[PDB]
Ligand binder design. Structure first.
Ligand SMILES: NC(=O)N[C@@H](C(=O)O)c1ccc(O)cc1
Ligand SMILES: NC(=O)N[C@@H](C(=O)O)c1ccc(O)cc1
Lengths: 300, 300
């Protein structure tokens, strides 16, 4: 009822020449191993169907569009939904969304154990830069290839659980966590592509892991929420991406952690009633919060 | 100019029978050792002039009032201001404020190196409970003995530095940090009386340190602010108070930490320009924040 097993399916590199068909096989295998370890839900990474294309400057718009989905699911990704419904396991999938009216989003969905899309979220905090910067060995052009999401920070019923979505950079922003905490989220999940080199601030490179885990622990604790972060990790097209995919308790304790830079599955026992230990005491919102003093946070 | 040395003056226990006169001696000694180690400012704890009286139920209102200050400074505390002006060192002092119009506040002030009170703050987030609870070996009746502060989260010029104040429980609330981060605080400082036993949630007792330090590191990182937390610590009137008084860099790295449960002074080199490493890149607020999605945080 209130007890489930949450899984994270960390992805090793996806090369530029690796088809969605070859990625779906890798996702199917991880989704199968999570079932066999008793998982009811598995979190997959940000932009989980392709290489991280925002590392390149594009001149050809057909080449750029080829990394986006025009439908969800499409025939190549459909087998992942079919297998999820067969095994009775929900998932969180990140992908690049192209909607033609041409709007571009960094998107994620929640799929329940029936294989039904129960909710969508579009990345609101876009990191990196807008224009090509030649000094960078690799680019991070999310501000060019995506518009900021227009759906807000919703929380959806997924089987037994109140679940909210972040995408990568969102996890560093207390406002993203707090909104979803105020909407009663019991699990906050998403994925990331996080380089271990930041060209403008290389003096925080050795803190990549620290800053990632610090963000997940603080968000979980301050909102008494279970959380899970699914990385795409390792040497991808000669850029190193941070590992340390994780599941976190509402106390902010890390209860599971990846140790490889490859396809790796981790699981943890989730008790949704454990949110109360914070939300009815230390972080009893109605009882403690003084929102008349917080107005500057919501000012445009 | 943009470089200073920040000190923290951690306090061991203050017994019920220990006069303000005997505490000022202890504060003078710590303030002298900080000067000798090149400190330009020292952070002192919450309610630094008395035992932590909110651990007891009071029936007599004269007995309760005796723990509050009706003026700041008074003659007994005046020597601490005089010594601060002589040595050229500012301080942050917490005390119980009684103002008659009768209003009761958990208060802290910033004093610059001239010995002039440059800013006041009143604790906005009150923890614990309102009525006596007999099962508790000790009470935490801040909701009875204080009203929520009415000054907001201001940020003040103190010599070369933009400084904001929290008081104890405030440090667990992202909203307190964020408001002061948005007002351009370079240092966020205050003190705490944090029991290592929480009677309603004893299953988080072993996490007292973790939760304290997690709050300071995450606040600092997410706002690119220097921070400092001054504890009153050790066995005070048979209640154990958490140590681990700390200074933290804008990266959320702990740059100094106490290891005793006694009067202890720690210092760190503060470079106020280091805020830019976060505030001009990863946490470039104007460039990244989407406050149209954050409205629920400011709803009453
Ligand atoms: N994919 C993302 O949203 N990645 C960002 C993040 O994880 O917050 C990130 C972090 C460090 C960088 O050098 C670039 C981008
Ligand atoms: N002075 C304070 O505000 N103390 C509170 C805090 O530090 O958050 C606190 C923390 C844990 C408890 O079990 C009781 C009270």
């Amino acid at each position: 009822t209130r007890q489930m097993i949450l899984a994270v399916g960390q992805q090793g590199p996806i090369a530029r020449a690796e088809t969605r068909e070859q990625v779906v096989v890798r996702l199917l295998d991880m989704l199968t191993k999570a079932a066999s370890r008793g998982a009811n839900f598995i979190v997959f990474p940000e932009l989980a169907l392709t290489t991280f294309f925002p590392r390149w400057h594009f001149t050809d718009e057909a080449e750029l569009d080829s990394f986006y989905e025009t439908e969800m699911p499409g025939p190549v990704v459909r087998p992942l939904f079919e297998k999820a419904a067969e095994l009775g396991i929900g998932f969180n999938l990140g992908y690049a969304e192209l909607v033609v009216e041409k709007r571009r989003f960094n998107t994620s969905i929640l799929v329940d154990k029936s294989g039904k899309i129960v909710g969508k979220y579009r990345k609101i905090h876009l990191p990196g830069h807008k224009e090509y910067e030649a000094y960078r060995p690799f680019q991070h052009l999310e501000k060019r290839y995506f518009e900021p999401g227009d759906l807000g920070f919703p929380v959806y019923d997924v089987d037994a659980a109140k679940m909210g979505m972040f995408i990568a950079n969102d996890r560093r922003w207390p406002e993203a966590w707090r909104v979803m905490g105020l909407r009663g989220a019991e699990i906050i999940c998403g994925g990331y592509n996080t380089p271990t080199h930041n060209p403008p601030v290389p003096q925080h490179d050795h803190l990549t892991s620290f800053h990632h885990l610090l963000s997940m622990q603080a968000g979980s604790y301050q909102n008494g929420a279970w959380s899970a972060a699914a990385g795409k990790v390792g040497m991808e097209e000669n850029c190193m991406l941070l590992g340390h995919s994780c599941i976190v308790a509402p106390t902010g304790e890390i209860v599971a952690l990846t140790t490889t830079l490859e396809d790796e599955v981790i699981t943890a026992a989730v008790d949704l009633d454990r949110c109360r230990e914070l939300r009815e005491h230390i972080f009893n919102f109605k009882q403690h919060r003084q929102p008349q003093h917080y107005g500057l946070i919501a000012e445009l």
